[PDB]
Write an enzyme that holds these catalytic residues in place. Structure first.
Site, PDB file in Angstrom:
ATOM      1  N   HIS A  62       0.855  -1.219   0.000  1.00 40.61           N
ATOM      2  CA  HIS A  62       0.000   0.000   0.000  1.00 40.61           C
ATOM      3  C   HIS A  62       0.883   1.259   0.000  1.00 40.61           C
ATOM      4  O   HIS A  62       0.581   2.213  -0.746  1.00 40.61           O
ATOM      5  CB  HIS A  62      -0.925  -0.047   1.227  1.00 40.61           C
ATOM      6  CG  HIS A  62      -2.126   0.831   1.133  1.00 40.61           C
ATOM      7  ND1 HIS A  62      -2.115   2.147   1.582  1.00 40.61           N
ATOM      8  CD2 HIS A  62      -3.371   0.589   0.665  1.00 40.61           C
ATOM      9  CE1 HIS A  62      -3.305   2.683   1.361  1.00 40.61           C
ATOM     10  NE2 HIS A  62      -4.091   1.746   0.802  1.00 40.61           N
ATOM     11  N   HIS A  63       1.914   1.279   0.843  1.00 39.48           N
ATOM     12  CA  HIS A  63       2.915   2.368   0.880  1.00 39.48           C
ATOM     13  C   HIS A  63       4.187   1.883   1.585  1.00 39.48           C
ATOM     14  O   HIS A  63       4.132   0.853   2.306  1.00 39.48           O
ATOM     15  CB  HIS A  63       2.302   3.650   1.464  1.00 39.48           C
ATOM     16  CG  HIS A  63       2.121   3.655   2.941  1.00 39.48           C
ATOM     17  ND1 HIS A  63       0.863   3.631   3.531  1.00 39.48           N
ATOM     18  CD2 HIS A  63       3.021   3.709   3.947  1.00 39.48           C
ATOM     19  CE1 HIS A  63       1.007   3.692   4.846  1.00 39.48           C
ATOM     20  NE2 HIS A  63       2.323   3.721   5.124  1.00 39.48           N
ATOM     21  N   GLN A 124      10.003   1.187   6.205  1.00 36.96           N
ATOM     22  CA  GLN A 124       8.672   0.729   6.646  1.00 36.96           C
ATOM     23  C   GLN A 124       7.817   0.340   5.443  1.00 36.96           C
ATOM     24  O   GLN A 124       7.788   1.105   4.490  1.00 36.96           O
ATOM     25  CB  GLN A 124       7.953   1.829   7.396  1.00 36.96           C
ATOM     26  CG  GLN A 124       6.681   1.323   8.050  1.00 36.96           C
ATOM     27  CD  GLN A 124       6.199   2.425   8.940  1.00 36.96           C
ATOM     28  OE1 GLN A 124       5.202   3.074   8.651  1.00 36.96           O
ATOM     29  NE2 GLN A 124       7.003   2.714   9.946  1.00 36.96           N
ATOM     30  N   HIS A 196      -0.576  15.874   7.012  1.00 35.84           N
ATOM     31  CA  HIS A 196      -1.054  14.800   7.906  1.00 35.84           C
ATOM     32  C   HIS A 196      -1.989  15.358   8.968  1.00 35.84           C
ATOM     33  O   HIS A 196      -1.586  16.263   9.687  1.00 35.84           O
ATOM     34  CB  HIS A 196       0.111  14.060   8.561  1.00 35.84           C
ATOM     35  CG  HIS A 196      -0.339  12.991   9.498  1.00 35.84           C
ATOM     36  ND1 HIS A 196      -0.573  11.697   9.085  1.00 35.84           N
ATOM     37  CD2 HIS A 196      -0.626  13.023  10.817  1.00 35.84           C
ATOM     38  CE1 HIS A 196      -0.973  10.978  10.110  1.00 35.84           C
ATOM     39  NE2 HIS A 196      -1.014  11.768  11.183  1.00 35.84           N
TER      40      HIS A 196
HETATM   41 CU   LIG Z   1      -0.734   2.464   3.049  1.00 34.49          CU
HETATM   42 CU   LIG Z   2      -1.291  10.902  12.961  1.00 33.53          CU
END
Ligand SMILES: [Cu+2]
Ligand SMILES: [Cu+2]
Ligand SMILES: [Cu+2]
Length: 308
Positions: A62-63, A124, A196
């Site tokens: 996904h990322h 990650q 974010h």
């Molecule tokens: Cu993701």
């Molecule tokens: Cu956050």
């Protein structure tokens, strides 16, 4: 990507070396798993990261995020990382997300190693649907990194604007978290940003304001994939400019007065501006946690107040 078996460190010459930073054949058992691993930098002197090649399964991943740090959270071949990835400050170098075009300008490098730079990359990987792992196959997804010991004439850095006093009462329809700071440094050229917020965030916008003129750095839905987008028109920040950002929030979606935190039930308002600078002058990190010009938001363009 395919599972190797060859060399993570491939020396390409006297100044350059490639780093294949790949999960060591992993099989997540649940949906939305977070796996991390680390590679020690194999030089104890300044290096510059000048390129990224994502080696991602479009099916499973996904990322992915690559960070620099000097203290990785675990020392395992791999580990689960829903926490902070690095115990010390995690410097983000590269973001990749499935549903997004990934964009460095020529001559730009991230300085690592030496007495001050990061000594470890932490990768990650966000895996999505285990449906792709019905076959108990092993994933080796990650990033190829081009390292050079040749001083790069442009040096990458991260400008973080965050709002620190963030409580909203549960009913209030529209609340602004406004950030602004006077830029007192040599020129940075802004080329990418990441916004974010948590769930009460509707839109986040960041501007350079020079002689009263608002030039757009970024506008994004902070509920969409959390990666970096390319700055539509690359911008330069100079002595005397104000960086202004505005996170627009609701109190209609959650039932209590939400406060700050890292986990997903608190409220953040962050904007990540990736820039570069001349090497002579270059800082790798800057922050703004203040609102030094609150009266100046009165001439913010209307786009900043409209969620798309
Ligand atoms: Cu993701
Ligand atoms: Cu956050
Ligand atoms: Cu220009």
């Amino acid at each position: 990507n395919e599972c190797l078996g060859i060399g993570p460190v491939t020396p390409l010459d006297a100044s350059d070396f490639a780093l294949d930073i790949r999960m060591p054949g992993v099989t997540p058992k649940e949906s939305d798993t977070y796996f991390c691993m680390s590679m020690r930098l194999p030089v104890d002197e300044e290096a510059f990261v000048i390129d990224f090649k994502p080696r991602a399964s479009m099916d499973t991943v996904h990322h992915m995020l690559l960070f620099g740090c000097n203290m990785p959270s675990s020392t395992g071949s791999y580990w689960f990382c829903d926490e902070g990835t690095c115990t010390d400050k995690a410097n983000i170098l590269y973001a990749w997300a499935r549903n997004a075009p990934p964009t460095l300008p020529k001559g730009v490098g991230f300085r690592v190693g030496g007495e001050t730079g990061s000594k470890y990359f932490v990768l990650q990987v966000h895996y999505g649907d285990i449906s792709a792992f019905r076959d108990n196959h092993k994933d080796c997804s990650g990033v190829s990194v081009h390292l050079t010991r040749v001083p790069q004439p442009l040096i990458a850095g991260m400008y973080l604007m965050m709002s620190v006093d963030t409580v909203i009462p549960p009913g209030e329809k529209v609340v602004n978290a406004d950030i602004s700071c006077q830029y007192k440094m040599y020129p940075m050229h802004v080329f990418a940003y990441r916004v974010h917020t948590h769930h009460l965030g509707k839109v986040v916008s960041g501007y350079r304001v020079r002689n009263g003129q608002w030039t757009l750095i970024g506008r994004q839905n902070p509920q969409l994939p959390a990666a970096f987008y390319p700055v539509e028109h690359p911008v330069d920040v100079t002595f005397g400019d104000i960086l202004a950002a505005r996170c627009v929030f609701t109190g209609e979606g959650r039932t209590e007065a939400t406060h700050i935190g890292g986990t997903s039930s608190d409220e953040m308002c962050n904007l990540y501006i990736m820039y570069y600078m001349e090497a002579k002058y270059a800082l790798s990190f800057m922050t703004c946690t203040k609102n030094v010009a609150p009266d100046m938001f009165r001439t913010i363009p209307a786009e900043a107040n409209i969620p798309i």
